[PDB]
Write a protein that binds this ligand. Structure first.
Ligand SMILES: *[C@@H]1O[C@H](CO[C@@H]2O[C@@H](C)[C@@H](O)[C@@H](O)[C@@H]2O)[C@@H](O[C@@H]2O[C@H](CO)[C@@H](O[C@H]3O[C@H](CO[C@H]4O[C@H](CO)[C@@H](O)[C@H](O)[C@@H]4O[C@@H]4O[C@H](CO)[C@@H](O[C@@H]5O[C@H](CO)[C@H](O)[C@H](O)[C@H]5O)[C@H](O)[C@H]4NC(C)=O)[C@@H](O)[C@H](O[C@H]4O[C@H](CO)[C@@H](O)[C@H](O)[C@@H]4O[C@@H]4O[C@H](CO)[C@@H](O)[C@H](O)[C@H]4NC(C)=O)[C@@H]3O)[C@H](O)[C@H]2NC(C)=O)[C@H](O)[C@H]1NC(C)=O
Ligand SMILES: *[C@@H]1O[C@H](CO[C@@H]2O[C@@H](C)[C@@H](O)[C@@H](O)[C@@H]2O)[C@@H](O[C@@H]2O[C@H](CO)[C@@H](O[C@H]3O[C@H](CO[C@H]4O[C@H](CO)[C@@H](O)[C@H](O)[C@@H]4O[C@@H]4O[C@H](CO)[C@@H](O[C@@H]5O[C@H](CO)[C@H](O)[C@H](O)[C@H]5O)[C@H](O)[C@H]4NC(C)=O)[C@@H](O)[C@H](O[C@H]4O[C@H](CO)[C@@H](O)[C@H](O)[C@@H]4O[C@@H]4O[C@H](CO)[C@@H](O)[C@H](O)[C@H]4NC(C)=O)[C@@H]3O)[C@H](O)[C@H]2NC(C)=O)[C@H](O)[C@H]1NC(C)=O
Lengths: 208, 208
């Protein structure tokens, strides 16, 4: 029959109070004859009624998926409360249950560094700024870029990578125009991580 | 029953004529009661008899794993010959075949940069040298470090990461004592890739 998977909120949504973190329950391979799925939600075994549930046609392989996202309180995630979805359908003998909560573990704040472009790039039209975020636990982190205050979108980062000392690091590569590098005052690597004071740390660099 | 997985040689073994690349077939979930397995190997459907096979007791879940590695010629892998293992066992109705060969893809040679430590890190007891390798296809690459000729093993790299332009990049971080950053004359990032001349490029950095 159908399978069910549960997912934690995005770490950025958890650490940014103006955003809405959500726990997600996904019912995969729902039968088309039988698309009625009831998904109910529990926070520490207390039922809640705020989840938004949608059916999606998966055109990759012509299947159906039902996705339920429960909006949650940030502090409830951080303080270790259990979120649980119960899925009922006809093709299911008994209801299938999934539970998730935040893993209580080692917390270690990252160091954040910005590396200027390599010298070899300074004669080209485009340069790469590198944000190196090092020594954090756990491995969940948001890393974004701005120039002065404006959001920069033309970056990619790596997976968090577990180092030999048991902590993680990540690289983020921002490509911008050498002219922009020359004219713009400042570029900022903005890091959200639970070990940081206020969950937030900005590092800024300028061309000299 | 059991299943069979086939794995390619490691890119470094492929690109260094002095090393021995191997195609590997792994049989998982062979029963403790029937650990015997028959395995044959074919290079372009000619049987070869050079494979090394070891059986492992997987005490974790009381199963058996058989790993067979065929040593292969570099040119045979690079030129796209088909490597095939056929596996039989009591608990398999008919023999399982797995095949593998090198994909004929785009080959794009990367640029290699070495970045010095970020300025804010030079106070510490250890500094990080960053090797940034940008714009390669396919995404198989070997990145290693030397100080002059001598191997420097205290490094971790990211996965290759697929960029915006459909090429890959990768970061490699070598951590070193700040004292060696000031004493040692040179550190080298050594990149082996299909698209590089002689499959090898060395980039070198010193403190200035
Ligand atoms: C038909 O096709 C569909 C679609 O297939 C996919 O899409 C196409 C286009 C191609 O890319 C396919 O190759 C794709 O696969 C098939 O559906 C898929 O079915 C799989 C089942 O066979 C199922 O498998 C794995 O799922 C998770 C990983 O899921 C994430 O990554 C997948 C990519 O690998 C994605 O497909 C998923 O979408 C999912 O991605 C995450 O999604 C969440 C929720 O949307 C999202 O979080 C939310 O994001 C919001 C913003 O977008 C916001 O932030 C919200 O607040 C937030 O909540 C994530 O951000 C997003 N991340 C990414 C990177 O995309 C695996 O975990 C799972 O493994 C577990 O189960 C197997 C057993 O089956 C075990 O072997 C395995 O070890 C795991 O077991 C678990 O182990 C841990 C620790 O070991 C334990 O703690 C757990 O208890 C234990 N759990 C269990 C249950 O055992 C699966 O391997 C895919 O999710 C699913 N995809 C979708 C989209 O539904 C379908 O199968 C096909 N049908 C047929 C008949 O063939
Ligand atoms: C009982 O337990 C065992 C052990 O379980 C593990 O250990 C315990 C303690 C726990 O930690 C568990 O969580 C662990 O799982 C279970 O065995 C496991 O069974 C899995 C299947 O049930 C099997 O699954 C995946 O295997 C490969 C990945 O394998 C590599 O990565 C793993 C994770 O890193 C490693 O652990 C593996 O050992 C393996 O590592 C690779 O090993 C090769 C071979 O040695 C090595 O290459 C050689 O290396 C040499 C140097 O040492 C030298 O360089 C040689 O030249 C070189 O050849 C590699 O270096 C190394 N690689 C890496 C990355 O580390 C997955 O690829 C595979 O995925 C496929 O299957 C599913 C479904 O088909 C798909 O989602 C997926 O896309 C793949 O499908 C493929 O898709 C393509 C197209 O996209 C098709 O063309 C393919 O044909 C298609 N394949 C098929 C078959 O259709 C599996 O998901 C685990 O490997 C295996 N673990 C071990 C250690 O054997 C067992 O299941 C349990 N039994 C139970 C519970 O009943």
């Amino acid at each position: 029959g159908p399978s069910v998977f549960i997912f934690p909120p995005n770490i950025k949504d958890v650490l940014m109070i103006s955003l809405t973190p959500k726990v997600t329950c996904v019912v995969v391979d729902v039968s088309e004859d039988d698309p009625d799925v009831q998904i109910s939600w529990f926070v520490n075994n207390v039922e809640v009624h705020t989840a938004q549930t949608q059916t999606h046609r998966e055109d990759y392989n012509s299947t159906i998926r039902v996705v339920s996202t429960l909006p949650i309180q940030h502090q409830d995630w951080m303080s270790g409360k259990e979120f649980k979805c119960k899925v009922n359908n006809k093709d299911l003998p008994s209801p299938i249950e999934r539970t998730i909560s935040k893993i209580k573990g080692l917390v270690r704040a990252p160091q954040v560094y910005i590396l200027p472009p390599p010298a070899e790039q300074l004669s080209r039209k485009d340069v790469s700024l590198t944000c190196l975020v090092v020594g954090f636990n756990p491995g969940d982190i948001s890393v974004e870029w701005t120039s002065n205050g404006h959001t920069e979108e033309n970056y990619k980062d790596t997976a968090p990578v577990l180092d030999s000392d048991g902590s993680y690091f990540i690289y983020s590569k921002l490509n911008m125009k050498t002219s922009k590098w020359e004219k713009t005052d400042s570029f900022s690597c903005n890091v959200r991580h639970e070990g940081l004071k206020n969950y937030y740390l900005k590092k800024t660099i300028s061309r000299s």
